[PDB]
Structures are given as C-alpha cells and as structure tokens.
C-alpha cells in the first residue's frame, strides 16, 4: 500500500487519525473494516453525534504496483449531553442505577461511556440473580442547540436458581476437591459475582492448566440454569531414584518423591533422603490443606541428618496448624524441637564469641572439642495472596512473613523474622508485558544478652536469591585462629600450627545476622515461542541486588581486616533468564554477569536449577 487519503476533515489532521490504523500492506485490505470502526469510535468518543462514513474506495495501480485507499468522511459538530432518562422494570434497584448514571451536565458526549453504562447495569443486575437482563439504549438528538439526551430501556427479567453444579474434567482428583472451592451453593439464587470466584479459586490451587466457566439453560424451565466447569489437570510432582555406588563411595543412594497433590487427594507430600560414606540425610513432610470442612490446615515434618569431619549432626520435628481469617489473609502457628551437636570444630572468632556468650570455654587453637544443645521453639507466620495463577502470575501480589521464637528452658535464646514479598503489575492488555518486583528481608537476634547461634545464620546468593553468584558467596567471610590439627603432615596453612602463625582472612562464608535482597524483572513474549511454548515458557530480563551483614560485629579488635558492620556493601548483577514448565516441572535457565562486586566475591555467570519456587 502506498497511500491512504482521508478527506473531509477540518477538526483533525490525517497524521493523527491514521496513527490508529492497522494498515500503513498488499493483500491485507480486508482489515480496513477495523480501521473504520476506529474512526467511528474516535469521532463518537468526541461527541460527533452525526458522524458517519459515506463511502470508501480501494484501487490498484497500473500493473499491480500498489494500492490506493480513500475514505470520504462527513464531519459534524459536537453535541452535549443534557441528562439521562431511565425507565422500565427496575425491580427496586433504581437507586443504584441512578448512581451508576450520574454525569456532570455539559460533559462531551462519548458513545463508549454510554456502552459502559449499559454494561454496568447488566453487571449490577447480575449480582442479584438477574442472569439475562434485557437492556437497550438510544440517543435523542436536538439539532437546534446540539443537545443529546440518552434513553435507556431496562428490563431486569427473572431471577435464576442453580439446579446442579457438574464437572467434566476430573480424571484423577476427587470431586470434593473442586466443590470445596466453590462459593456458589446449589439450591440458592445465582450470583455472577459469586460464580466468578470459582474461576480464581481453581487457579490458585495450581492443579489445572485452564478453567472454563459456562452457563446452560434447563430445557424444561424458563428460570433455572446449570453451571459447568471444565478443567485440564497439570501433571504435578515427581519421583526420583539414584544409585551412588562406586569404588570411592562404597554403597550409597539418593531417593525421594515430592508432590503438591498426592494421588489426587489434596494432601501435599515430600520424602527425601540419601546415604553415603560421609553424610546421612532424611526428611519427611506431610500436610493437609483441609483438616476440617471450613479450611483449617494441619501438617508437619520430621528430619534427621549428620555430616562427618568438622563433625556435626542434627534432627528434629515441626508441627504446624493454620487457618484463614478472611477471604485473602491467613495465619500459621506451631511448635517444634531440634537437637544439634558439634565436634572437631575449627577455631573461629565468631564461633568462639558465641561459645563465650553461652558460657563455654574452648581451649585456644585446639580442635579436640564438642558442643551439644536441645532447642525447643515456637513457629509462626502470616500470608496474603491474590495472584491469579499457580505458576505464571499476571496480577496481584503476595506477602509471606515468618518467624521463630525460642522457648525459655531451651539452650539457645533467639528470635528470627523474615519477610518474602512479590508484586506483579501488568502493562499490557493481553498481559504479555509485565513488571515483577521481588524483595526479601530478614533479621534476628538473641535474648537475655546472649548471641545468635551461628548455624541459624542467613546466607544469600545463588539462583534462588541473587542470580550470577555462587550459593552462600555473599556476606562476611571466616577469620580463623592460628593449632591441634591432624593434617599438619600434608591443607590449610592457618589451621595447622606448623604454618599457622597469626590471624588470617579467608573465603569461607559464615553468613550473617541480617540480609536484604531485591530485584526487578520484565516478563515479555518473544518471536521464538510457539503455542507449544507460549503456554509453558516465560522469558524475562532482570536486575538483581542484595546485601548481607553481621549485626554485633566488633571491628574495634580487628584493624587489619574488613569491617563487617557496614551494611552498605551491596552486591549487584543483571541478566536474562528463561523459566520453562517442562514435563519435569518449572526448570530455570539463567545467565548473568555481576557488575558491582567486592573483594572476596566468587562469580558464577551461568546457573541452572529445577525451579519450583518463586
């Protein structure tokens, strides 16, 4: 196409009006109707009550070289809206209809506003069971003074009742699983605002790829309908087994199963463990999102592990109860216990400060030591969630606050609080361009004048927190004391008395007592994603930052080493990542290059994991 000639205008130029056209090519002329609708709206949105199109022409050049398009427009004047007259079978709702109809006298007529008012009347009536209202509207034009009056013919019709709610997509899940999520009860009046709750509820569970709502009339009765939901189950969870047997490892194994839906019953499970010559690990986690019919949840986990030299082990239990307090907020609380023991520890400044605050007196530079405690704790938290998807959110925000407090009588005295937040904001009517913010904070400390135990310290960095850095790389590093090592014949020169002469810096992360991490991501569509991928893979661009610091660090005794009390040493990186919902789950592929780094930082520009978080 070479040129589109729009003629007959005086109020607007061609350059602006043509800017809303889809055409700007050969064999595409069939889309012209949409541009004409655009013109009708453009002028109708400005009060041109008499605007119309008298003719259009499309023609070929000689020898099919190009196309000319010409549109003949008759442009009228602007009309004012004097008021709105509403009459008919209002059925007692005239006050709300009038409130939805109020305008400022003298406002420019806008055809879209009229359509919106009609749609709002239908929406209002749907709330009270008027499933099929009959609403029509039309303008009255007085040309003597360019005045338009709006007339609306409203007939609410009949109330509808729901006779049965049927499902046709449950191949594995129990029927009860979906009925628990409906907020519309059978044998009661229909509410459009109540039925729509079901399509959100069935998405928040995260068990379905799609939820299709429907309303069908009963052929034998003018006032009853059936509601039918169609779902397609997403394969969820996996079972893994591996063999670690070898000539160096001996006989070893790894195995576990994790599902967010167990055999379709609604219970979540996780069973994991491994055994080899140097460490043992096992964990069992089971929880019931529905203990009672009203949504009270209950579950917990048991765990055990040990590591050989330093040498340590721990085990414990956590039982948590929780429940909703409104449609969107919920609370959790529970109790637990952990046993911990250490032996053959390398002398460290932070660890020894802890031990001295605890009343322990380890010998200087001597690995022949041990320590053990039994700690009983109280767990609690709070959540908020209005996201519209289980895996790839498009709107809403999520907040998850958690924490722990020790119980007097325990060996350790501490508290810990964390906060996990994320917000999705769309910038696209088709929800393809979205801005996602994510933040995390955490802080804790001791009570009674004692210190926080070092094994509960926070670490940051890794593909789950700050992309591009090695796991647990961000934060204060260990400083070792100079001397009872059994590795002296071969090894760390600072630990062995033969070479250990003074205090030394190191790259061994100890973690901190406070952290803050944040990032911003842009979620976008790409030209290389086909329908097979359009529904399963998300492509995004991102910028990450974060900082971890040591509360109660005392720099006054250490002048030749970095000061870890300064929280401002923020590490930052940026990059691009792809999140793919494969048959094995939401795998995450990412590459990033740190651009702001500090001494001691370890980089890992490319990371991959199996996702299933964030």
């Amino acid at each position: 196409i070479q040129q589109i000639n729009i003629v007959g205008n005086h109020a607007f130029t061609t350059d602006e009006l043509i800017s809303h056209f889809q055409l700007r090519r050969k064999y595409q002329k069939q889309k012209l109707a949409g541009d004409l609708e655009t013109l009708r709206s453009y002028y109708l949105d400005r009060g041109y009550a008499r605007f119309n199109i008298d003719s259009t022409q499309v023609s070929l050049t000689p020898d099919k070289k190009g196309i000319y398009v010409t549109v003949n427009i008759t442009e009228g004047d602007q009309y004012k809206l004097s008021g709105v007259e509403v009459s008919g079978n209002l059925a007692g709702h005239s006050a709300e209809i009038e409130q939805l109809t109020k305008i400022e006298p003298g406002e420019l007529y806008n055809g879209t506003k009229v359509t919106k008012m009609e749609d709002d009347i239908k929406k209002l009536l749907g709330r009270y069971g008027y499933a099929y209202p009959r609403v029509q509207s039309m303008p009255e034009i007085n040309d003597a003074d360019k005045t338009v009056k709006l007339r609306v013919n409203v007939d609410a019709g009949n109330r509808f009742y729901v006779r049965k709610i049927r499902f046709e997509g449950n191949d594995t899940s129990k029927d009860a699983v979906l009925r628990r999520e409906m907020r519309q009860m059978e044998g009661a009046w229909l509410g459009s605002d109540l039925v729509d709750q079901g399509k959100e509820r069935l998405n928040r569970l995260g068990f379905f790829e799609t939820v299709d709502t429907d309303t069908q009339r009963v052929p034998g009765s003018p006032d009853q309908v059936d509601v039918v939901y169609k779902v397609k189950e997403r394969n969820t969870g996996c079972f893994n087994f591996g063999i670690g047997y070898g000539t160096e490892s001996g006989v070893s194994f790894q195995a576990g199963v994790q599902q967010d839906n167990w055999l379709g019953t609604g219970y979540a499970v996780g069973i994991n463990g491994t055994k080899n010559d140097y460490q043992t690990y096992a964990e069992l986690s089971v929880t019931n999102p529905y203990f009672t019919v009203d949504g009270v949840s209950l579950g917990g986990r048991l765990f055990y592990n040990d590591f050989q030299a330093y040498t340590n082990k721990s085990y414990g239990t956590d039982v948590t109860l929780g429940f909703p307090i409104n449609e969107y907020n919920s609370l959790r609380a529970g109790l637990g216990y952990v046993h911990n023991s250490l032996s053959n520890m390398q002398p460290q400044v932070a660890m020894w400060r802890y031990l001295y605050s605890m009343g322990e007196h380890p010998s200087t530079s001597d690995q022949d030591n041990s320590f053990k405690t039994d700690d009983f704790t109280f767990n609690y938290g709070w959540t908020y969630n209005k996201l519209d998807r289980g895996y790839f959110p498009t709107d809403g925000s999520r907040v998850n606050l958690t924490g722990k407090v020790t119980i007097p009588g325990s060996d350790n005295e501490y508290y810990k609080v964390t906060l996990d937040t994320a917000t999705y904001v769309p910038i696209d009517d088709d929800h393809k361009w979205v801005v996602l913010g994510r933040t995390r904070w955490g802080y804790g400390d001791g009570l009674g004048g004692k210190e926080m135990p070092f094994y509960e310290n926070f670490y940051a960095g890794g593909s789950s927190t700050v992309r591009g850095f090695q796991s647990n790389t961000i934060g204060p590093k260990a400083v070792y004391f100079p001397q009872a090592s059994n590795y002296d014949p071969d090894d760390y020169e600072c630990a062995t008395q033969d070479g250990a002469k003074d205090l030394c810096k190191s790259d061994d992360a100890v973690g901190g007592n406070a952290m803050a991490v944040a990032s911003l991501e842009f979620i976008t569509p790409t030209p290389f994603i086909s329908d097979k991928y359009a529904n399963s893979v998300r492509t995004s661009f991102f910028w990450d930052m974060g900082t971890v610091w040591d509360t109660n660090w005392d720099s006054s005794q250490y002048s030749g080493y970095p000061d870890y009390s300064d929280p401002s040493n923020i590490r930052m990186s940026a990059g691009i990542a792809l999140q793919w919902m494969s048959p094995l789950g939401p795998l995450v592929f990412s590459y990033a290059q740190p651009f702001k780094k500090y001494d001691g930082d370890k980089a890992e520009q490319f990371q991959f994991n199996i996702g299933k978080t964030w």
Binding site: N235, C238, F239, I243, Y245, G246, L584
Partner: peptide, 24 residues
C-alpha cells in the same frame, strides 16, 4: 548407558551414575 522410556519416565545406568526419574 541410558534410555528414554516414556513421557515423564527416564531411566539410565550411566563407579556408576545410574538413576531413574518418574513424574506423574
């Protein structure tokens, strides 16, 4: 040293790195 048996079913033998993965 390995095999692809079914969608969501993977097996292999890979001293050894033998493993199996099954997803529902």
């Amino acid at each position: 040293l390995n095999a692809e048996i079914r969608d969501n079913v993977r097996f292999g033998l890979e001293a050894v790195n033998a493993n199996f993965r099954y997803c529902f």
